[PDB]
Ligand binder design. Structure first.
Ligand SMILES: [Zn+2]
Ligand SMILES: [Zn+2]
Length: 53
């Protein structure tokens, strides 16, 4: 017997709740990350969906 499932999803570098996803790369990234991407002309949209912000 053995198990090892990861629950919450946090950036492997920032370790912060991932509330975004980069299309181009097709991977999930955190908020801080976005900055870089959004700067490199990378498409990024919120997972949870639309919010007040
Ligand atoms: Zn990150
Ligand atoms: Zn990107």
């Amino acid at each position: 017997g053995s198990s090892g499932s990861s629950g919450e999803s946090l950036c492997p570098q920032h370790h912060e709740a991932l509330s975004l996803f980069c299309y181009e790369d097709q991977e999930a990234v955190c908020l801080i990350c976005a900055i870089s991407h959004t700067h490199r002309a990378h498409t990024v949209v919120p997972l949870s969906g639309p919010s007040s912000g």
